Structure formats: C-alpha cells, structure tokens
Amino acid sequence: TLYVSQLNEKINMQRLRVNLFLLFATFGEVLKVSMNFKKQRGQAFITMRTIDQASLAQISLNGERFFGKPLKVEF
Amino acid sequence: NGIPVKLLNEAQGHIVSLELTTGATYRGKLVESEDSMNVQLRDVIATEPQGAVTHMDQIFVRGSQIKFIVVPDLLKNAPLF
Amino acid sequence: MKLVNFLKKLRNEQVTIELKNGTTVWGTLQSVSPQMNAILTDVKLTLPSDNIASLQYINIRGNTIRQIILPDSLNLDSLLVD
Amino acid sequence: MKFTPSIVIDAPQYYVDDLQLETESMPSSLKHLTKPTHILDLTNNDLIMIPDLSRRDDIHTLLLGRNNIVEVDVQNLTLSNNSIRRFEDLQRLRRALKNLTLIGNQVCHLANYREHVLRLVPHLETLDFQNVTAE
Amino acid sequence: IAENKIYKFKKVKRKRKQIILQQHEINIFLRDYQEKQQTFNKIN
Amino acid sequence: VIISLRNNHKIIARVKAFDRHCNMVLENVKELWTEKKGKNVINRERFISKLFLRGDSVIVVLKTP
Amino acid sequence: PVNPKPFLKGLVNHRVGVKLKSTEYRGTLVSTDNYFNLQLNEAEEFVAGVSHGTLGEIFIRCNNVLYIRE
Amino acid sequence: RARDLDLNEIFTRDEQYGEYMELEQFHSLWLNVIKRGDCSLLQFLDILELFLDDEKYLLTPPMDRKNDRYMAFLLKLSKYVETFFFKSYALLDAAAVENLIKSDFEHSYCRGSLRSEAKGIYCPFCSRWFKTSSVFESHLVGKIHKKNESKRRNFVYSEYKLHRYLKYLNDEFSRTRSFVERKLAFTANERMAEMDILTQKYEAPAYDSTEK
Amino acid sequence: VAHSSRLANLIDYKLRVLTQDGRVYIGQLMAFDKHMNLVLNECIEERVPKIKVEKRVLGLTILRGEQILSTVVEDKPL
Amino acid sequence: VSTPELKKYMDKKILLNINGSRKVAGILRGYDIFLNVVLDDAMEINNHQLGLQTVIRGNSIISLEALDA
Amino acid sequence: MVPPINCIFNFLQQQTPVTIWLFEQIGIRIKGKIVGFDEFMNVVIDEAVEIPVNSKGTPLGKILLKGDNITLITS
RNA sequence: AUACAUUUUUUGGCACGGACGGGAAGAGGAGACGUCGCGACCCUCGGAGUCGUUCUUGACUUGGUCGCUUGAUGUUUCUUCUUCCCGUUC
Ligand SMILES: [Zn+2]
C-alpha cells in the first residue's frame, strides 16, 4: 500500500479515485483511499493486493505527471 | 415479530431517509418507530415529486404511505444481525 | 373449503400468471405460499404487444397476481377433496 | 492458455474499489460470464488485438494494460503499455467512451498525436489522464 | 435390433437422453464432415 | 355466469370453486375487454382452458338464465 | 338509535341503489352479511344515471361499494 | 467439438427428449378458434387423428378451411410438428426429406392424387370436385383457380406437410395419446409422482457416474 | 442461481426488486418478513423516465412489502 | 396494538396532509389506536373554513406536519 | 383527550349538519346528519346532500355511506 | 461409504437506391421551479480517533460562489419542414 502525494487537489473525489484505479491497474489490482479534508488534500493511499505489485507501481511511476502535476510516491 | 420492524427501531438517533407513495423523500433524525412504521422525524428536508424542496421541523408519517426507508450503513454491523 | 389448499397441491405446473397491471407471466409453480406469493422457476415475461424477457427465478406477490392460468390437463374434483 | 468456460468461472469475481471480473492469446467466450461485470481486467497477458467480444451491455471498463494490442476491431478504456503504432489504428475508436488511456504506446510519439485523437474522437473527456480543453 | 448387437457382442442399453445427445453430436460431426469435403473439392 | 372486473373484463366462465375471498376456479373462460388506441373501436376476446381468479378484482358476479 | 346493521337487515327485499368506486346500480336486495357483501335481484345498471342494461340477478362484492340509496 | 451443445435448449420437459410431443399448448390455442369450450384434450387429439388419413383432414375438416383463425392456427400447427420431426431424428438429411415432400407435393398432390370413383377428382385449393380428367385439366388455367393458388399456396403446402410429418410420427402420436389417458386417470399422489420423474429425466446428466 | 424452494433459504443473495410505481431495486437481501418487508444491503434505486435507466444509490434500505411487486435474483453472494 | 405516540403533538396546530393532494390544518384534540384524528377545525388548503371541529379517518392521512414546534 | 369512537357517539345525539368528503374523490362531497354508529367508521346518514366541489346543489335521498370512503367527519 | 378477507401490509382507488438516430446551418424546439457537473482573472494554504478493564472485549463522540462563449437531468402549461456530413439495418 503506497502513499502518494503532490497531486492536483482540484480533481473531484469520485473522479480522482477512478483515475487512480485505472493508472495503477498495470501494476496490479487497485483499491485507492483518499479524502478531501484539509489534512488530506492532494493525498492518496492506493492499497495493492500483492506486495511486489506496489513496488513496481512506485518506482516506474515516480514523478509521473498526473492532472498536470508530477506525483510523489512513498511506502 | 417482524425483523425489518426491529432495525427501524434501531434507526433511532441516526439520519434516516423516507419517501412516500406520493414520491416525497424526507431526511431527518428518526425519533420513534412502532410495529406499523409510524415514524417521527426532526430537522427534516422534504423534496417535491417535481423537484422542489421545503424545510420543515417535526413530521409524523403513517406507515401505510411508505414506499421505502433508507437507513445509514452503520446499523449494518451491530446488533440485530 | 379453502382455495389456498387448492394452490398448495398444484405443484411443478408450467402455468401462465396474469398480473394486476396486465403482465403475462409464463412460469412453473414450485411452491405457493398461503398468502398467494407464487414461487416460479423458468420464467418468461411478456407484456399485454411488446417484447419478451426470459428469466430464471421470480417470486411474485399475491395481490399483484390477478389470475393464475391453470394447466391444460387437470382433474379439479380430486383436488377439491380434502 | 486459451479462454474457455473452465477459465472464466474460477477467475475472481469481486467488486473493485463496481463488480469486477479478474482475468491469453486472444479473447473469446465472454458469453460465459453472462454480462454480470461492469469493469474487466485483461492486464498482464499476451492479447494481440481486442477482437471478438460478444454483446455485453454491462461491461463499461476494459483494463487492457501490458499487452501487445496493436489494432482495434464502454465508458472507460485503459490501453496502457501496448503495441499501437499508427493513429489510423485508433480510427476504430470513433464508433465507441469518456475515459481513454493510450500511454506507453509507440503511436504516442507521433507528431500531432494529441490533436488527431481529440478531433476524430470527440466523445473522449479524459485522454492520457488529462482533461480535454476547448483550446 | 432387439439384442442390441452388431456382429457378436451385446452392449449395455442406454436411455433416450444419451442417445439423442449423440444423435445431435454426430450431426455437428457430419456438418463438419461435409464442410471440409466442400472446400476439399474446391481445392483439389 | 358473467363477472365484471376492475379493469373492464366481462369474465364469462363456469364456476368450479368458491370461498370466503371469492377466489374462484374458472372453466370455459371468456374475458371480454378492449385494448384500444386513442380513437380505436375493437372488441377483442379469447378462450382459456382453466383459470384461477382473485376476489378483490371481482366487482359484480351476474347469472344469466 | 338507528344503527347501520339493523337498517341493512331491514332493507332486505326492498329496492336499493349502489354506486361504485364509477357506475350506479338499481335492484331489489336479496340478503347481506356483516362484511357488507350484497346480493340483488332485478338489476338495472345506470351509467351516470343512464340505464345501460337490465342485468337481473347479480352479486356485488363488498370492497367496491360507496353508498346504498332508496 | 461439442462442449456447449445442450439438449435442454432444444428439447422441453413435456416432450421427454422426443418421447412425447407437447400438444397441450396448442389445445389452448385451439379453444380460441372454435368459439366454444366443448373441446376436451382427448377430443382435440381425436381432431388431430384426421391428419393421419389421406382423406379425413381434407374431406371432413374440423371447420371451414377458409376461416382465417383456422388457417392461422394450422400454419403454426404444421411448423412445430415439422420442426419436432427433424428435432427427434437429427441424424437424417433435412433437405433430402424436405425436397422429397415437395416433389410429392408438386407432382402428385397438385395433379390430383386424391381421386374418388363417384365424384371424380378433388382439388385442395378449390375445395370442389370434378367430373373427368379433361374437365379437371381445363380448370387449372381458369380465373377462379388462379386466385386460390395465388392466395392459399402457403397454407395448403403447410397442410400437406403436417399430414406427411405426422404420418412419419405415428408411433409418437399414439404414445402421446396414451400419456393423456394415463394422466387423466391419475390421482393427486399419482400425478405428483409422475411430474417428479418427468422432471428428473430432464435435469439429470446423460452420463451417470455409475455407468459401464 | 441455484434452484431454491423458498425465499428465506436464499438469504444474502443479490436481488432485483420491482415496485408498483415503476421503480427497480437491486440489492442484497439482509432480511425477509411476514408481510414481505425487505432489508436490502446495498440497494440502488433504478427508475426509467417516460427513455433510459436512471440510477440512484441509496444504501441500507427498509422496503415496505406493500409496494413490492416481485423479487428476482440478480447475482451470486460475496 | 401499540398506541401512536402523539402525546408530544397534543393541543398543537398541525398540517394534516390527506389524500388527493389536499391539506387539513387544526389544533389536536385526541386520537385512537387506528390513528383517526379528532381536532378543532381550521382551514383547507385561497383558504376557507368549514366546521367547528373535524374528525379525520386514519386511512386518508399522508402525513401530519406540525405548525407549532 | 376526546377519542374518535366517543366523538361519533356525541354527533348522533346532536343531530347537526355533517359534511363528509369522499376518499380519492375530490369533486363530490356529502352533507347530512349522522344517524348510525358501528364498530368501524360506517354510519347511516339520513337526508344527505351531494355537493359538487368548487374548483350548487343536487338532489339526493337518505343514505348509509360505507366507512372506507370516509375522509372527514365534522359536526 | 457408514387458520383465515370491513383503516398500517396479502384481498389494493385500479384503469383509460429506401428507413432510424446524432450533430451543425437556414426558413415559418421555447419561458420558469429546483439538482450537480466543465473553466476560473475567484475563495481557501494543509469505517475511523480515545479510555475503562484484561490477555481480549464493552461504552462515548465524528468543495462555497461566478461564468457554460451552445454542461447533463426531472415536474409543469402552451404550439414543424427542406438540404449537407457521420454510423446502424435491408
Ligand atoms: Zn384446382
């Protein structure tokens, strides 16, 4: 489950989950959790079923431009 | 006893919804429910079948005119089931 | 005395069911409730000039069911016996 | 590994974060799922083209990542990291769709790839995870 | 017919569903048999 | 006998069964109605072998000599 | 003191008229019960007060009754 | 090759995979046409017994043969019994039998294969008799017989088929009549026991785990 | 869907539910009742205006048995 | 069986919504187990009064929304 | 608390003009005097007057009206 | 393999080459009542948490608005044709 931030925080909560569900799909199955509260804006946790599916997801998509902004991933 | 009667009894306190046979949805705090679903609500919004809304304070609703009642998902967990 | 018990003994019969709003329902009565809640299997739904929808399992409510078309070969007198 | 009725029924069918079916040389025998899944997953396979589906009204998302999709024969379509080269191979998407992903393709480095896709396919609202503007 | 044999040996009797199943199964075999035969005449 | 119905079905049939609810088994079943378009005059009717009936739909049972 | 059920039993073998939930009726009452199920002889069917047909011996289901009149 | 071939999609339960053929559903349609309810299920099969003889369906019909509802029912009645014939015997060449009946329909039936010694030669489109073959040949180009052959071509060709296919299914037709005469004289427990066994033949596999 | 004998035995299945006004409810049966009152797990209110199926996601619904026309089984468990 | 608990609503003016998209106003007097409502009469929803006190059948009642809080 | 069972009992001994409305039937109203009392709401109401609703008067005799079609009682 | 139909449930107030579709131009679809979406010279700047008791359980609490320069969608009253381009069927 990889912690990704520095996202464009204008993109809608029903919309932002649906774009993360397709983009991390290549790495593995996706379950993305995020909110719109002031602590949590621009922030997301995508939960992978397989552990190495998260590891391939973080390194290859590091700094990839998403909704205009290059997102930063963590473990 | 009816089991959907008992969960509506558990729905006291929470923010429930209620549409009539006219097609008038409600949303407010469930006060009291009975065997026949004679439900009371507070701080309730009321949508017209055309679409218009009217705020109103304290409604009593006879169960025969109920089409459905929406309960929050927190009552899914405990204790009735 | 009861036609409820007439419905309980009618089993596994490929029947037609007519609803209050006119929907013709081809179905097979596996069991019938005491309050006419007919339980069907291998159902075929047809409207009273419009298209057909086939379905597996449909449990219809009793006040909706206006008329159950009874089957073709059936002795009624032996069924009326208690 | 061919698509068959033995394959699809043992494949995982759980709701994704819509009801999803988890799944290959070429895709076939998609009647056996009986149109019960909206989002599908055909990722990490060797599908050469998206060809031969049945009539599937409920299917709205095709996750076709990490394949060799080089040709075309529905609200969201993820075709990430496939074998598309020519923009004319995208002309069969003209009949289809609000979400499209064709990143990871050799076609993406063609000149005027963004303008050729957005004009011939107007129904797209999101192309390579960027919203299509008026200008 | 009645002893259900062809040259010497009597087989075990089958029910009607397994027979008619094979009668439609040999039917799609004969359709495959004639379909291949048509193209084979159109190449040879 | 002839039976009127809620949705205008003149039901001509033979009575077999009868109860409290006026739930009825019918032999030699003849419903009379009209499925019409706006500005349409058609009398259409059919026969059914055997038919079960619900009692609330019944308005008036009438008996012809 | 005239209650509804002795009046209904009193009005047996007398002319009555029945409106539906809508077509008006006319006939001589045969017998009734507690549930207000009706039986009439010499039925005359008034379609909004217009005599359509003479039905004769009829049987009115209780749920459709709206009033009884002389 | 035959993974998805399902006999439950081709056969029904009231046929028992070609053992019987369901004709109760057509008795339901048959009552709509006759404008009475005096037809029982055995009397309707007795009406279908006219279609076994070469003369009985054609010289003493149930009705007038020019009733619209009667002609509408008999096309469906031809069509199901025709498709039932090819359904129960899938190993036979369909076009070979179909062209055979059409050859017998064109060369013999349309030339007057029904000939009687007192009235002469009968014609199905004309529903009339003819004295000699010279006056029979002289009506085939007349204006009356042009109209009936141009309006009733499909119905008579369907009526000749339902004759010839039911003669091919004579052992099936006698067997269905025995079923009704059995089922009518059942009790409640006897009929409920029978409806189980008929369903179990429908929904159990063609190969058991206990076969040799 | 298997060949079940009563409704109460087929609990926690995904049910399509019709009603008198024209609405179509899809949702998992949590509970049955004597008057066919139904508790639905994730119930989606589906309506067709006089053209295309419109969608409304409700959640946990207590549905009155008076309004229900029929119940059809939509899907498997889980 | 159980009584409709209108003991909060007692002696208060309530808009009693009835069948046919009609509305009845008036101050509450009493009730029974079938939810039939006896009330001192008010106007019918431009606006007009008929009667001194009215008695409402329980089957007619869509709802009863209180005017006083 | 004045119950509706007791309230009809007082109307019978008062013999005052009652106006009854009809259930799911707006345009027609009944105006007469309550005579009967039953365990249900069913009454006999003699010398009644049918009234067409303003969006006049019609002749009408003495009538028992079935209690399921009662909407209002006021006397 | 070992129980009953007269107000809250079910006895209901129910019923009455030829076509298609989308988009645009022109000639003789429109006015409002609410809902949420695209852009922003605007605002705004970062099932879960805690305790009591015991080796596992109980209680208490929890995007706003402006434009649309042709954004989608329901009630409620009144009164379409010709051409061009795209796709389906014969
Ligand atoms: Zn001739």
The 3-state secondary structure of H33-71 reads HHCCCCCCHHHHHHHHHHHHCCCHHHHCCCCCCCCHHHH
| DSSP letter string, D72-96 | ----EEE--S-----GGGGGGGG--
Q: Which helix (H) or strand (E) holds H83?
A: helix H68-88
Q: How far is CA D131 from the centre of its chain?
A: 19
Q: How far apart are CA F56 and CA E19, in angstroms?
A: 51
Which amino acid does the sequence have at D127?
A: L
Where in the sequence is the domain holding D125, given as residue range(s)?
A: 1-135
Which amino acid does the sequence have at F11?
A: I
Which nucleotide in the DNA or RNA is closest to residue I54, CA to C1'?
Answer: L73
Strand L bases with any atom < 7 A from protein Cβ? 3-16, 33-35, 37-39, 45-47, 63, 70, 73-76, 86-87
Domain chopping of chain K, boundaries = 1-75
- Are residues H21 and H172 in contact, defined by beta-carbon separation less than 8 angstroms? yes
Q: Which of residues 42-61 of A touch strand L (CB under 7 A)?
A: 42
Q: Are strands B53-61 and C38-46 parallel, antiparallel or unpaired?
A: unpaired
For residue C7 the two structure tokens come to 């419905």
- Are residues I40 and I28 in contact, defined by beta-carbon separation less than 8 angstroms? yes
Whether there are 3 or more C-beta pairs closer than 8 Å between C and F is yes
Chain D nearest C-alpha distance from I68 (Å): 24
Give the D window 48-67 contacts with A, CB below 8 Å. Answer: 61, 63, 65-66
Whether there are 3 or more C-beta pairs closer than 8 Å between K and J is yes
Mention every residue, 6+ apart, whose C-beta is less than 8 A from residue D128.
Answer: D100, D101, D102, D103, D108
| Residue B30, CA distances (Å) to B45, B64, C51 in order | 13, 17, 44
| Pick from A22, A50, A18, A55: nearest CA to A34 | A18
Q: How far apart are CA K11 and CA I55, in angstroms?
A: 52
Give the position of tokens 């922030």: A43
| Pick from J16, J18, J40: nearest CA to J28 | J40
**Torsion (CA) D11, D17, D18, D21 in degrees, nearest 10:** -10
CB–CB contacts below 8 A, D to I:
4
Beta-carbon separation of I70 and C59 below 8 A: yes
| Pick from A59, A26, A20, A66: nearest CA to D79 | A26
CA of H57 to the centre of ligand 1 (A): 17
**Torsion (CA) D18, D23, D24, D29 in degrees, nearest 10:** -70
| DSSP letter string, H141-201 | TSHHHHHHHHHSHHHHHHHHHHHHHHHHTHHHHHHHHHHHHHHHT--HHHHHHHHHHHHHH
Beta-carbon separation of G59 and F55 below 8 A: no
Structural domains in chain G, CATH included, are 1-70 (2.30.30.100)
List the CATH number of the domain containing F60. 2.30.30.100
| Pick from I20, I64, I76: nearest CA to I39 | I64
What phi, psi does K25 have (nearest 5°)? -150, 95
| Pick from K50, K73, K75, K74: nearest CA to K62 | K50
| Residue F13, CA distances (Å) to C73, F52, F63, F64, J7 in order | 17, 11, 11, 11, 55
For residue J42 the two structure tokens come to 């008010």
| Residue K32, CA distances (Å) to G17, H75, J44 in order | 18, 66, 20
Q: Which residue blocks in chain C are alpha helix, DSSP H? A: 4-9, 77-80
How many structural domains does chain F have?
A: 1
Tell me, in Å, the resolution of the deposited structure.
Answer: 2.5
Mention every residue, 6+ apart, whose C-beta is less than 8 A from residue H119.
Answer: H129
Sheet architecture: strand order including D39-41: D13-15, D19-22, D39-41, D61-63, D76-78, D99-101, D126-127, D130-131
How many beta carbons lie within 10 A of that of residue C70, not counting itself?
23
Mutual angle of helices H153-168 and H170-184, in 10-degree steps: 80
I70 → closest Cβ in C31, C41, C64 = C64
CATH C-level class of C1-82:
mainly beta
- In DSSP terms, D127 is beta-bridged to D100, D130
| Pick from H21, H12, H14, H15: nearest CA to H168 | H21
Where in the sequence is the domain holding I56, given as residue range(s)?
A: 7-73
Q: Are strands J13-18 and K17-22 parallel, antiparallel or unpaired?
A: unpaired
Pick the CATH number of A1-75 from 3.30.70.330, 2.60.40.10, 3.40.50.1170, 3.30.230.70: 3.30.70.330
Fold category of K1-75 in CATH? SH3 type barrels. (2.30.30)
| Pick from C65, C68, C41, C67: nearest CA to C55 | C41
Please indicate if any CB of chain D lies within 8 Å of the CB of A48.
Answer: no
Residue nearest L69, CA–C1′ metric: D134
The dihedral through the CA atoms of H130, H131, H134, H135 has a sign that is negative
Cis peptide before G6 (omega within 30 of 0): no
Q: Does nucleic acid strand L have an atom less than 7 angstroms from the CB of C63?
A: yes
- Are residues D106 and D121 in contact, defined by beta-carbon separation less than 8 angstroms? no
Residues of B in contact with I31 (CB under 8 A): 3-4, 7, 81
Mention every residue, 6+ apart, whose C-beta is less than 8 A from residue I22.
Answer: I47, I48
Q: Does nucleic acid strand L have an atom less than 7 angstroms from the CB of F44?
A: no
Q: How far apart are CA C54 and CA F53, in angstroms?
A: 25
CA of H156 to the centre of ligand 1 (A): 12
Chain K nearest C-alpha distance from J2 (Å): 16
Q: How far apart are CA D103 and CA C78, in angstroms?
A: 74
For residue C6 the two structure tokens come to 């007439």
| Residue B73, CA distances (Å) to A22, B15, B77 in order | 27, 11, 8
Method: cryo-EM
Q: How far apart are CA E19 and CA E33, in angstroms?
A: 20
| Residue C23, CA distances (Å) to F43, H30, H42, I69, J24 in order | 20, 23, 31, 11, 38
Q: How far apart are CA I31 and CA I7, in angstroms?
A: 10
Mention every residue, 6+ apart, whose C-beta is less than 8 A from residue D6.
Answer: none
Length of chain A counted residue by residue? 75
J2 three-class SS: coil
CA of H140 to the centre of ligand 1 (A): 6
**E strand residue ranges, G1-70:** 15-20, 24-29, 38-46, 51-60, 65-69
The dihedral through the CA atoms of H145, H149, H150, H151 has a sign that is positive
For residue I63 the two structure tokens come to 């549905």
For residue G47 the two structure tokens come to 């379609």
Mention every residue, 6+ apart, whose C-beta is less than 8 A from residue H111.
Answer: none
Å from the D35 CA to the L20 C1': 27
| Residue K12, CA distances (Å) to G2, J30, K9 in order | 10, 19, 5
The dihedral through the CA atoms of H141, H142, H143, H147 has a sign that is negative
- Are residues D45 and D66 in contact, defined by beta-carbon separation less than 8 angstroms? yes
- Contact residues of D toward I, CB < 8 A: 13-14, 19, 36
Q: Which helix (H) or strand (E) holds H100?
A: helix H94-104
Residues of G in contact with F61 (CB under 8 A): 58-59, 61
Residues of F in contact with C76 (CB under 8 A): 16-17, 25, 27, 50
| Residue K61, CA distances (Å) to G20, K46, K48 in order | 17, 7, 6
Q: Which helix (H) or strand (E) holds J25?
A: strand J22-31
Give the position of tokens 């011939």: D120
- Are residues I70 and I25 in contact, defined by beta-carbon separation less than 8 angstroms? no
For residue C41 the two structure tokens come to 């299997």
- Are residues B44 and B28 in contact, defined by beta-carbon separation less than 8 angstroms? yes
Q: How far apart are CA H170 and CA C8, in angstroms?
A: 38
Residues of F in contact with C27 (CB under 8 A): none
K69 three-class SS: helix
DSSP state of K70: B
Q: How far is CA F39 from the centre of its chain?
A: 25
Where in the sequence is the domain holding F31, given as residue range(s)?
A: 1-65
- Are residues C60 and C40 in contact, defined by beta-carbon separation less than 8 angstroms? yes
The dihedral through the CA atoms of H37, H25, F3, F7 has a sign that is negative
| Residue A71, CA distances (Å) to A2, A22, A31, D61, K10 in order | 12, 16, 18, 24, 80
Residues of J in contact with K24 (CB under 8 A): 19-20
DSSP state of I8: G
Residues of E in contact with H19 (CB under 8 A): 16
D17 → closest Cβ in A21, A26, A68 = A21
Whether there are 3 or more C-beta pairs closer than 8 Å between H and C is yes
Sequence-separated contacts (24+) of C74-80 with Cβ below 8 Å? C74/F50, C75/H184, C75/H186, C76/F16, C76/F17, C76/F25, C76/F27, C76/F50, C78/H187, C78/H188, C79/C6, C79/C9, C79/C10, C79/H188, C80/C6, C80/F16, C80/F17
What phi, psi does H124 have (nearest 5°)? -70, -40
Chain F nearest C-alpha distance from C46 (Å): 16
Give the position of tokens 């774009």: A19
D129 → closest Cβ in A26, A30, A67 = A67
Q: How far apart are CA K52 and CA K22, in angstroms?
A: 11
Residues of F in contact with H34 (CB under 8 A): 47
Residues of F in contact with C66 (CB under 8 A): 53-54, 57
- Are residues J53 and K74 in contact, defined by beta-carbon separation less than 8 angstroms? yes
- Are residues D70 and D48 in contact, defined by beta-carbon separation less than 8 angstroms? yes
Which amino acid does the sequence have at B48?
A: E
What phi, psi does H107 have (nearest 5°)? -85, -35
- In DSSP terms, D15 is beta-bridged to D19
Which nucleotide in the DNA or RNA is closest to residue B51, CA to C1'?
Answer: L34
| Pick from J28, G8, J14, G35: nearest CA to K7 | J28
Please indicate if any CB of chain F lies within 8 Å of the CB of H32.
Answer: yes
G-contacting chains (≥3 CB pairs under 8 Å): F, K
CA of H137 to the centre of ligand 1 (A): 9
- Are residues J64 and J13 in contact, defined by beta-carbon separation less than 8 angstroms? no
For residue I9 the two structure tokens come to 């035995």
G64 three-class SS: helix
CA of H104 to the centre of ligand 1 (A): 17
- H77 exposure class (CB count in 10 Å sphere: 0-12, 13-18, 19+): buried
Please indicate if any CB of chain F lies within 8 Å of the CB of G43.
Answer: yes
C57, C63, C65, best to mutate vs chain I, most I CBs in 10 Å: C57
CA of H60 to the centre of ligand 1 (A): 18
| Residue K47, CA distances (Å) to G69, K30, K44, K62 in order | 11, 10, 10, 5
How many structural domains does chain D have?
A: 1
- In DSSP terms, A72 is beta-bridged to A5
Structural domains in chain J, CATH included, are 1-69 (2.30.30.100)
- Are residues K66 and G36 in contact, defined by beta-carbon separation less than 8 angstroms? yes
How many beta carbons lie within 10 A of that of residue K17, not counting itself?
15
Å from the I50 CA to the L33 C1': 20
D17 three-class SS: coil
DSSP state of C5: H
- Are residues A65 and A6 in contact, defined by beta-carbon separation less than 8 angstroms? no
H-contacting chains (≥3 CB pairs under 8 Å): C, E, F
Which amino acid does the sequence have at H48?
A: L
For residue F20 the two structure tokens come to 């409290």
